[PDB]
Nucleic acid binder design. Structure first.
Ligand SMILES: O=c1ccc2ncc(=O)n3c2n1C[C@H]3CN1CCC(NCc2cc3c(cn2)OCCC3)CC1
Lengths: 200, 508, 508, 200
DNA sequence: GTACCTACGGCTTATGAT
DNA sequence: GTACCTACGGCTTATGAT
DNA sequence: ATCATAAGCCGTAG
DNA sequence: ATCATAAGCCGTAG
C-alpha cells in the first residue's frame, strides 16, 4: 500500500503537492525519471479495474490501494493531496480506463469531485520535424490545419517534462458536477448500451 | 492554463471506445468473414514469402514481424489466435498447418512460441488468389507507412464455412460451421435462378456441421434460425447400451467445445454425491483409434434410464444459441442466409471485373511496346548508321523520334483496341511514327535479338497477345460470359476440396 | 533392450557441459572481445539492413529475427543484453543507439520490448568494416542452413576499451575500461618498436577509465595488475566540505555500478541505528545539471571525521578485482597487456592481407572481361554479319570462338599480371583469341555502347584498373607499405572518435 | 504435491508401473498426449534444482515434490514405483540437469540406486528423409557412418510414442554403484573444478 | 523456468427467498 | 497487465564461536 | 582477544 | 408450491 509503488515527494504540507495515475511499468519508469523531486507524486496501476455499478459489493475489493493512499475513507475528515491528475495514453483503451476511473470517483466520493480537485491531462499527439522546424501537435484538428506516440512509455523523460508536467507549459483540464443525471445509469443496463450507440 | 470543462466530456470519451470495438475488433464481415487480426496475420505470412510447399519456419519470426509492421497490440493475443487457427478440432477447415504441441481436447495449453513451426495450407492460397492484380483497396497502417488490403479476394464463402464468435460492446454474434460442397451447390442454385425462396436453399443445405460429429434433435431450431436470424439448437452425444453374449455404456464422441477431463471429474462428483444412481466405476481407453469412454452399469439396472438421467443432468447434451450478426457496409445488421449468399456473389462479380480490366491494360501496354520493337528489327542497317553518327544518346533518341520509317513489307491486326487509351491519334498512322518510350525500348536491345530464331518468337507472341486481348474484351462484353466463368470456377473449387458429412440430423 | 551401464557415465555428461560453457557462452576473445551473443546480434542487425542514418525500428523485429535464425536460447536473455548495450552509464562507448525508457542509475528496469526503438551507432560500422570481402571464416548455424562470421574484422581494440565480466564453470574474468586515444597511442608506439618494455606502455597508458568519473587511490594495484594479470584497485567517490560565508557535504558522482536508492536507504539506516555520528538529515537535488546529494552536518562537528567514517563504512569506497582471462586459440590463458596488443596487431595484419588479395582478384577478372569487350567494339561490322548469318545463338558463340580477330590499330599494358591465373597460355597471344565467357560477354551488349561517348569511358576504366592492380601488387610486395597503411588507418580512427579523460588518478 | 502436476496411471500394484521426469510445459504436454494410459506416469519439473553438496541444509527445501510423491522418506519402508526413468533433451543443459538429479539420488537414497531402479532414456538425435527413405539416428557416430531435434517438446506425440516410450522399441539404460569413490567430492570444491578440466 | 487479476453479452446451473 | 525460483566464481559485510 | 560461517551482487541461461 | 438472484465459460484485449 504505502510502500511498494507510491513514491511521494519531500513536501508534506497539503494543498501544495500533486499526484498522478498511469499504467504501471511502461510509463511509471519515465514518469519517475523525468518528474520533479519536490512536490510530485506517482502511483502506477495494473491493467484495468472492475466497474462499481456492474458489480457492487462492499466486500468486493482486490487492490484498494487508492482508497488506502489518498485518504482513510467519510472523505471530509482527511483531505491530503488537494490536487490529483489523471494521465493516460491517447489510444482507445486510454479513454476506456478514463471512463472507469471517473465513474469510480463520481460514485464513491462525490465531494472530492464537486470541490474541483480532479484534473485531466492533455499529452501531445504528433511530432513534426522538417529539418530544424520542430512542432508539437496535440489534437487531430491541429494536425489537419498544419511520428505518432502510442504510449507515454515511449518518449524520452525530458520530452515528458517539457510537454506534460511543466508548471509553465502544461495544459490541464478541470471537471465539474453540473447536474444530477442518469447517464451513469445507462452506463451498464444492457438496454441503453444496446440503444445508445445509434450514431448514424 | 486550466479551462473549465463540463462533465459531459465522459460520454464523448466512452462513445469513442464503442465505435472502435464494433468496427475493428470483434464483428467479422459478410464478404469474407475474417476479423482484422486473421487478415493481417495471413497478409504477413504471404508477404514474408512462406507458401505451403516449402520448409517450415519458427513462430518467433512471424509473431515478431506481425507485431512490428501491422498489428501493434502485444504478443499473447496474436500467438493465441495462431494456435487457435492451427487446431484441427476447433475449425472445420484449418488454415495454418503446424508442427509441434498445439494442445488437444484435454484442455492442455499449447507449447511456448519458441518450439512450434508453422506454414500455410493448400486452402489458404485460395483465400488470397490474385492479390497483386489490383483487385481491392489499400489502407494505411498505424503510422501511415505501409499498406494493408481491406477485404480479401476470396473464392470460398468463409463466413458460412467457419463462422465466428465475438462479443462487442452492445452486440454479440455466433454462427455454426457448415459443409463445403453443400454451400457450393446452394450458390450454384442461386446463380441458376435469382428469385429462389428459402425452401429450395433449405433443401440443398440440410443443416450445420461440426468438426467432431454429434447428433442433432430438433428441426424447428435450425428452421427458425435460418429464416429469421435467431434460434437455439440442441447437441447430443453418441452412445449406446451393450451386453456381452452385464450392461455397459460406451461413448465415442462428445459435443462441440467440451473439456473431457472436466466432464469425467464432474461425473465422478455426481456419482460420489449419490445424486445419480446406477454407476459403479468409470474408465477411459482413448487411443489412436478414436475416443472411447467406458462406464460400468451397476448390476440390476436397465441402464437406459441411467442414460436418460445423464442426458438430463450431464454436459452430454448442451444447447447452442445461433445468432447471426455481421457488418454489411460498416454497420451491424442481423442477416439471414439469402442475404449472405447475395453479398458473396456480388463481391465475386466485382473482383472478376476488376481483375479482367487490369490484365487487359497490361497486355495492351506489352503489345504496344513489342510493335515498335518489331518495326525496329525490320530496318536494321539505317538505325546502325544513325546511331554511329549521332554522338549523344539523347540526340540519337531525338533523331529516331524525328523521322518516319519505311515499315518493310514483311512486317505488315484488329480494327482497333490494340493500342492504349492515353496514346494520342498522332502515332502509328506504310507510314509510321515512334514515341520516346518506344525509342528507349529500341535503344535497349541486345545482339541475341538479331538471329533467325527470335523473329518467329516475336511474331508468335504478337499473335498470342492479339488473341488474348480479343478474348478479354469479349469477356468484358456481355454478362452471360461472366456468369459462365464464375460458374466454372466455383465448380472447380467444389471438385478440388470436397468431402463428406460428419454429423447426422435426426428428426424429433 | 536394457544394456548394463557403469555409473562413471555421470562424469562424461558433466564434462561435456563444461566444454560448452567455457568456449561458447561467457569468456570473450582476445582478438575482438565479444561474447557470441553480441556477435550474432550485431550480425543480424547488419543483415537486416538497419544502418545509423535511417529510421528506427521496433525491438520486436530484431529480437524475433535473432531468435529465429541464429541464437536459439529464448528471448529474455537477448533483450536484456540489448538493453545493457544501449545504456550510456554502463559502457564507455555505447554501440546500440536507442529511444525509449532504458532505465537509469536508480535501478529501475527498462520498458517492455514493444515500445522501445533501436538502431546502430556510428562506431558500430567500424567494428564491421569490410565484412563482405571474404576476410574471415564462416561457421554453420544450429541446423547447418546459414552462415555466421567467426571473428569480426575489427578496427578498434574492443577488449581493452569496453572489457567484460563473465563467470564460467572453473574460471572467471573481469577487465576495466580504458580511453581510446591512449590505447591508440600505445599501439602506435608498439608498431614503432617491436621490443618495447612495460615501462613505455605504462607511460603512454596511465590507467583505467570509467563511464562515471571517480578518484583512484593506489598505483601498486594497477601496476601489479598490468604486469602480472591479477590485482585489486580502490574506487573513491568525489565529495567536499563546505560552509557558507554551518558545514554541509555535497556529493557529485558515485563509484562504478552502485545503486543510488540503495545507498540512500542504507545511510538512512546507519543514521537510525546510531552506528555513525554527526548526520542530521539527508536530501537529494538531482536534476538535469548533474547528480547532487546533500547531507547536513550535525552542529558542532568537524565533518571531515564524519567523512572518513563514511569512507570507511559506506559504499562510497569500493574495491575492484582486476583479473584478465580470455581465449587465445580456443583455450583460457591469463594474459597481460603486451600479449593483447600483439594479438590485435597480428589480427589486423591478417585482415588487411586477405582483403587486398580479394580486391586484386576482383579487379583482375573485371579487366579481363573489359579487354575482350573493347576488342569486340573495335571490329563492329563483321560481327554483325557473322551473327545475322548464324541462326543459332550457340552456333554464333562457337563461330565467334573459332576464328582469330584483326585487333585494329586503334586498340593497341603491363608486362604481365593483367590476366587471371586460371587462364591458360593459349588465349590472347595483332593476334588474339577469345573465350566462351568473353563470347557471351560480347553477345550481351546493348546499342547504347555504340556511340562516341562510351569508347572514351572504356579506355578510362581500363587505365584506371591497370593503375589500381599495379598499386595492389605493390602493397602486397613489401611489408613496409603494409605497416604504413595500418599506421595511417589507426591514426585516422584516432582522429575521428577521440575524447578526453573523465576519471583522475591521484597518487597515494 | 499429489495433485497439480502428477498424473498417475490406472494400475496401482507396484513393481509394474513406470515414472518419468522432464521439463515442465514444453515437454509434459506431448508426454501426456502421447503416452499410454494404463501403467505410465509423468512428473514435470521447473527449471533447475539446487545442489545437495554445495548447500546442504535439512531445512533448505523448496519443491520437495519428488520426496513427497515417490515415497515417504527411510526408503526401505515404502517402495512404490519400482522403476523410474530420467528423460531430458540432448543439448548440454540436459546433461547438466542429469548430473544434478543423479547426484541427488546418490547422496540422498543409496539403496534405491543400488538395487537397480533408476534408468536413463535415449532419445533420437536426427531424422533423415530421402523421399521415401526415412531414418532415425540416435548418436553422432551413426550420423557419421550414414532435421535436428533440440528438445522433446518439438516432435509430434505419435513420434514420441514410436521412438522413446514403446515397450517394444525403446532402448533404455541401467545404472550401477560399482565402487565408493570421491568423484562427487571433486564435484564442488573449487579446486578440483579448477584442475579437472585439463582435457588437452 | 513458470500463474493470477480485470472488460465486454448470452447461455447454463446453483440457492435460498414469497 | 504484471514477480518469484534456480546455476556458475570472486568480492564485500554480518555474526556468533575458541 | 581473533575466527569459522553465512549472506548479497555482478551476467548468460532454465 | 414457484421465482428473483448470483455464480462460471466461451475469445481479443489491458
Ligand atoms: O511464467 C510466468 C509466471 C508468472 C508471471 N507473472 C508475471 C509476468 O509478467 N510473467 C509471468 N510469467 C512470465 C511473464 C509473462 N511473460 C510472457 C511471455 C513474454 N514474452 C515476450 C515476447 C516474446 C517474443 C516476442 C515479443 N515478446 O517477439 C519475438 C518472439 C518471442 C514475457 C512475459
Amino acid at each position: 500500500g504505502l510502500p511498494g509503488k507510491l513514491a511521494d515527494c519531500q513536501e508534506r504540507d497539503p494543498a501544495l503537492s500533486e499526484l498522478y495515475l498511469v499504467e504501471g511499468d511502461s510509463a511509471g519508469g519515465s514518469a519517475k525519471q523525468g518528474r520533479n523531486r519536490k512536490n510530485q507524486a506517482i502511483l502506477p496501476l495494473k491493467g484495468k479495474i472492475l466497474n462499481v455499478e456492474k458489480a457492487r459489493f462492499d466486500k468486493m475489493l482486490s487492490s484498494q490501494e487508492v482508497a488506502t493512499l489518498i485518504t482513510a475513507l467519510y472523505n471530509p475528515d482527511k483531505l491530503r493531496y488537494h490536487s490529483i491528475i489523471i494521465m493516460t495514453d491517447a489510444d482507445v483503451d486510454g479513454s476506456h480506463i478514463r471512463t472507469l476511473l471517473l465513474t469510480f470517483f463520481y460514485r464513491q466520493m462525490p465531494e472530492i469531485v464537486e470541490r474541483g480537485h480532479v484534473y485531466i491531462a492533455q499529452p501531445p499527439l504528433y511530432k513534426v520535424k522538417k529539418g530544424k522546424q520542430e512542432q508539437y501537435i496535440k489534437d487531430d484538428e491541429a494536425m489537419d490545419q498544419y511520428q505518432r506516440y502510442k504510449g507515454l512509455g515511449e518518449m524520452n523523460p525530458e520530452q515528458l517534462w517539457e510537454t506534460t508536467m511543466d508548471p509553465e507549459s502544461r495544459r490541464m483540464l478541470r471537471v465539474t458536477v453540473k447536474d444530477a443525471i442518469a447517464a451513469d445509469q445507462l452506463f451498464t443496463t444492457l438496454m441503453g448500451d444496446a440503444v445508445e450507440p445509434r450514431r448514424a | 492554463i486550466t479551462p473549465v470543462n463540463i462533465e459531459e466530456e465522459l460520454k464523448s470519451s466512452y462513445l469513442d471506445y464503442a465505435m472502435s470495438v464494433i468496427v475493428g475488433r470483434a464483428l467479422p464481415d459478410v464478404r469474407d468473414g475474417l476479423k482484422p487480426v486473421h487478415r493481417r496475420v495471413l497478409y504477413a505470412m504471404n508477404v514474408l514469402g512462406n507458401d505451403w510447399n516449402k520448409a517450415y519456419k519458427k513462430s518467433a519470426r512471424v509473431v515478431g514481424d506481425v507485431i512490428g509492421k501491422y498489428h501493434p497490440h502485444g504478443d499473447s493475443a496474436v500467438y493465441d489466435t495462431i494456435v487457435r487457427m492451427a487446431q484441427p478440432f476447433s475449425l472445420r477447415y484449418m488454415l495454418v498447418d503446424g508442427q509441434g504441441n498445439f494442445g488437444s481436447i484435454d484442455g492442455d495449453s499449447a507449447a511456448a512460441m519458441r518450439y512450434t513451426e508453422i506454414r500455410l495450407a493448400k486452402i489458404a492460397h485460395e483465400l488470397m488468389a490474385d492479390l497483386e492484380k489490383e483487385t481491392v483497396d489499400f489502407v494505411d497502417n498505424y503510422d501511415g507507412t505501409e499498406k494493408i488490403p481491406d477485404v480479401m479476394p476470396t473464392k470460398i464463402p468463409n463466413l458460412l464455412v467457419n463462422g465466428s464468435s465475438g462479443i462487442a460492446v452492445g452486440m454479440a454474434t455466433n454462427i455454426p460451421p457448415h459443409n463445403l460442397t453443400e454451400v457450393i451447390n446452394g450458390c450454384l442454385a442461386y446463380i441458376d435462378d435469382e428469385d429462389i425462396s428459402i425452401e429450395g436453399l433449405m433443401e440443398h443445405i440440410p443443416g450445420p456441421d461440426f468438426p467432431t460429429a454429434a447428433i442433432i434433435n430438433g428441426r424447428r431450431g435450425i428452421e427458425e434460425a435460418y429464416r429469421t436470424g435467431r434460434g437455439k439448437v440442441y447437441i447430443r452425444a453418441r452412445a449406446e447400451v451393450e451386453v456381452d453374449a452385464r450392461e455397459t455404456i460406451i461413448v465415442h464422441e462428445i459435443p462441440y467445445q467440451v473439456n473431457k477431463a472436466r466432464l469425467i471429474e464432474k461425473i465422478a462428483e455426481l456419482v460420489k454425491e449419490k445424486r445419480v444412481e446406477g454407476i459403479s466405476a468409470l474408465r477411459d481407453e482413448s487411443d489412436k483409434d478414436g475416443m472411447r469412454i467406458v462406464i460400468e452399469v451397476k448390476r440390476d439396472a436397465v441402464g437406459e434410464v441411467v442414460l436418460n438421467n445423464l442426458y438430463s443432468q450431464t454436459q452430454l447434451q448442451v444447447s447452442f444459441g445461433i445468432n447471426m450478426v455481421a457488418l454489411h457496409h460498416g454497420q451491424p445488421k442481423i442477416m439471414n442466409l439469402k442475404d449472405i449468399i447475395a453479398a458473396f456473389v456480388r463481391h465475386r462479380r466485382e473482383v472478376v471485373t476488376r481483375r479482367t480490366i487490369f490484365e487487359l491494360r497490361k497486355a495492351r501496354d506489352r503489345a504496344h511496346i513489342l510493335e515498335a520493337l518489331a518495326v525496329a528489327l525490320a530496318n536494321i542497317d539505317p538505325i546502325i548508321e544513325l546511331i554511329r553518327h549521332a554522338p549523344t544518346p539523347a540526340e540519337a533518341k531525338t533523331a529516331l523520334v524525328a523521322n518516319p520509317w519505311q515499315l518493310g513489307n514483311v512486317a505488315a491486326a484488329g480494327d482497333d483496341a490494340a493500342r492504349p487509351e492515353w496514346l494520342e491519334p498522332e502515332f502509328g498512322v506504310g507510314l509510321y511514327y515512334l514515341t520516346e518510350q518506344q525509342a528507349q525500348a529500341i535503344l535497349d536491345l541486345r545482339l541475341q535479338k538479331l538471329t533467325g530464331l527470335e523473329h518467329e518468337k516475336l511474331l508468335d507472341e504478337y499473335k498470342e497477345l492479339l488473341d488474348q486481348i480479343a478474348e478479354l474484351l469479349r469477356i468484358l462484353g456481355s454478362a452471360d460470359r461472366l456468369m459462365e466463368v464464375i460458374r466454372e470456377e466455383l465448380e472447380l473449387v467444389r471438385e478440388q476440396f470436397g468431402d463428406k458429412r460428419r454429423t447426422e440430423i435426426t428428426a424429433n
